[PDB]
């Protein structure tokens, strides 16, 4: 065995563990989610596991979807000098075209044999795994300050008397047993002798700190396009209440969509409809209020 504990400022190591674990957790959660936002009229007719596509797109490798046996299996694809042949690395096994491939972008609208590359972002300047590191430390220390604020927001009622058995019988039989009408000696024995340590310099501070945590989440959120935007259009709470500057959050949402524009180039080739929409739906009540067809009653209940 080996044991000799520090003190009870162990909490001052537990506090910094909460901050450190919050940064690690929020960082890898936020990129645990971020490669699924778009999902684009999900599997109309096309054999793509789009989850495996979007995970590949957020490590910035240019995937290439084409035909394999007329059914659109993904492949990897790493002034205008045109690409034609299957020179690139190919991830499937025997489903390779073994024939004339092409990029279907500008050779014509809708004619050439399909192997179209899809960028994550049309013009690439900085990776957004750096922006997610940029705010999560700032977010980490505001989560530190919230946790440190509510950890010292606890309150005792200090009794103050010369020690051995004068005031103990008082609080036992007449405060925590709830008793009104306790009788005492005239020796100033509650003339502000019992005192309260309060932290009312802490609870007005508490709510404003939560609002700073909240709008910093929103200021990370609208950067990476994930937004509450369309419902904010129909709710009429459009500007300076949701302090987000709508023209910037509809801006950063749009760059990721027109990065995945070459799926429309593919969609024009084989005669089908694939639009890169932007997912904001969460179900069992939204699907109920949009239909209210009695077959949807036998589906849910």
């Amino acid at each position: 065995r080996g044991l000799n504990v520090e003190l009870s400022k162990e909490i001052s190591k537990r506090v910094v563990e909460h901050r450190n674990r919050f940064k690690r957790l929020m960082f890898n959660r936020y990129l645990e989610f971020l490669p699924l936002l778009i999902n684009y009229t999900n599997r109309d007719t096309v054999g793509i596991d789009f989850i495996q596509l979007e995970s590949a797109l957020r490590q910035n490798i240019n995937v290439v979807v084409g035909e394999a046996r007329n059914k659109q299996i993904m492949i990897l694809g790493y002034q205008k000098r045109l690409t034609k042949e299957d020179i690139y690395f190919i991830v499937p096994d025997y489903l390779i075209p073994d024939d004339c491939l092409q990029i279907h972008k500008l050779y014509d609208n809708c004619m050439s044999g399909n192997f179209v590359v899809m960028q994550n972002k049309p013009i690439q300047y900085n990776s957004d795994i750096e922006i997610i590191e940029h705010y999560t430390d700032e977010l980490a220390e505001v989560a530190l300050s919230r946790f440190s604020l509510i950890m010292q927001a606890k309150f005792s009622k200090i009794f103050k008397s010369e020690i051995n058995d004068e005031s103990i019988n008082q609080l036992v039989s007449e405060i925590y047993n709830g008793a009104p009408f306790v009788k005492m000696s005239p020796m100033f024995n509650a003339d502000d002798d019992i005192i309260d340590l309060t932290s009312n310099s802490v609870i007005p501070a508490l709510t404003e700190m939560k609002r700073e945590y909240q709008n910093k989440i929103s200021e990370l959120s609208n950067y990476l396009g994930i937004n509450s935007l369309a419902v904010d259009k129909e709710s009429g709470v459009s500007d300076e209440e949701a302090k987000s500057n709508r023209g910037f959050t509809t801006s950063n949402s749009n760059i990721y969509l027109k990065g995945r524009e070459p799926i429309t180039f593919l969609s024009k080739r084989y005669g089908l409809d694939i639009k890169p929409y932007y997912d904001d739906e969460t179900t069992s009540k939204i699907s109920m209020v949009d239909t209210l067809k009695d077959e949807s009653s036998d589906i849910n209940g």
Binding site: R69, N70, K71, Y94
Partner: peptide, 22 residues
């Protein structure tokens, strides 16, 4: 879909041929 199915059958037949002369 039928055309795709036919294409798949043709491909499988070709693959089968490419392994045995019979």
């Amino acid at each position: 879909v039928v055309l795709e199915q036919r294409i798949a059958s043709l491909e499988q037949q070709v693959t089968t041929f490419l392994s045995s002369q019979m």
